[PDB]
């Protein structure tokens, strides 16, 4: 009984930044995310399950969404997306489309376009009920360099504040 206060809900494997190490290519150092294997005292490895929200954000940013219908067409196998979206019930798509920007001159317009796309795609974190106020701060024009820091606002696993305007996220058990 009284023990109750701890959800029996668990978390599955989570993709993590720099799980497979950096990859230098003389332009900089990338992250190459993947799955982190946590070892034990006596063999018995196990996949890690931390940073759930960042895991969803990586799953969203780093997967191509469906392309838009053009008169040119697409190769049967290049039109992006996931067939598993045919079975979900929330009536949404899976992935992002930052890599589908219609490039143009005057890189300020390209920056604004990428901002719009990244924000529209990351809003699915709030729509799923995992964060509350995800937001981006994409600001640069350089030659082509761009910085795109992302903030994923979260909660705790026990409602400690009374009288909020919104409504507790539906999945505040991941701790966001």
Site residues (CB under 8 A) for another protein?
A: 1-3, 15, 19-20, 32-37, 47, 58-59, 62-64, 72-75, 77-78, 80-83, 94-95, 99, 160
Residue 116 CB, nearest approach to another protein (Å): 19
Residue 82 CB, nearest approach to another protein (Å): 5
CB of 48 or CB of 171, closer to another protein: 48
Sign of the dihedral through C-alpha 85, 131, 148, 108: positive
Q: Choosing among its own copies, another protein, none, which partner's interface includes residue 47 (Cβ < 5 to 8 Å by kind)?
A: another protein
Tokens for 82, please give them: 């996931």
Using left for φ > 0, alpha for ψ between -120 and 50, and beta otherwise, residue 81 falls in left
Residue 126 CB, nearest approach to its own copies (Å): 13
- Contacts to its own copies by CB under 8 A: 67, 69-76, 78-79, 160-166
CB of 57 or CB of 169, closer to another protein: 57
Q: What is the largest CA-CA distance in the chain?
A: 65
Using left for φ > 0, alpha for ψ between -120 and 50, and beta otherwise, residue 69 falls in beta
**Whether the Cβ atoms of residue 13 and residue 19 lie closer than 8 Å to each other:** no
């Amino acid at each position: 009984c009284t023990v109750d206060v701890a959800d029996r809900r668990k978390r599955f494997w989570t993709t993590q930044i720099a799980a497979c190490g950096t990859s230098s290519d003389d332009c900089g150092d990338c992250a190459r995310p993947g799955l982190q294997l946590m070892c034990n005292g006596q063999g018995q490895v196990t996949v890690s399950t931390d940073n759930y929200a960042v895991g969803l954000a990586l799953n969203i940013l780093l997967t191509d969404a469906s392309k838009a219908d053009t008169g040119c067409g697409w190769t049967p196998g290049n039109r992006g997306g996931f067939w598993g979206d045919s079975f979900r019930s929330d009536n949404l798509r899976s992935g992002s489309k930052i890599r589908q920007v219609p490039t143009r001159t005057s890189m300020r317009e390209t920056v604004s376009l990428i901002r719009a796309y990244a924000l529209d795609d990351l809003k699915k974190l709030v729509t799923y009920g995992v964060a509350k106020s995800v937001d981006v701060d994409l600001t640069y024009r350089g030659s082509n360099k761009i910085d795109m820091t992302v903030i994923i606002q979260g909660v705790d696993g026990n409602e400690s504040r009374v009288g909020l305007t919104g409504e507790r996220i539906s999945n505040a058990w991941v701790w966001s």
